[PDB]
Amino acid sequence: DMRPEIWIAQELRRIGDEFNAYYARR
Amino acid sequence: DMRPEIWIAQELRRIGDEFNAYYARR
Amino acid sequence: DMRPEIWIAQELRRIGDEFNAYYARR
Amino acid sequence: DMRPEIWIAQELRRIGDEFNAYYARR
Q1: In chain D, what are the domain boundaries?
Q2: Motif BH3 located where (chains A, B, C, D)?
């Protein structure tokens, strides 16, 4: 869904989730 | 707290909260 | 400013791709 | 690369500042 209030929230979760997965592996 | 797992998460919440507040006003 | 709000989602995707590339190097 | 993880927080702050300036124009 490219409507901005869904898409922005999803991108923020992607950034946060990928950082946490990286940092746990690090 | 500038430790990365706190600071990154807080910047993400700032971006998301500021967007939602703006979009409600818009 | 004429930009649609999706510019924010697009920029979050772009920067998240930079973070992703950095994690993979590490 | 060898960048500190806080480069991510610093970049999120910088882009969040751009988003904030956009909200003020809108």
Answers
A1: 1-26
A2: 8-22
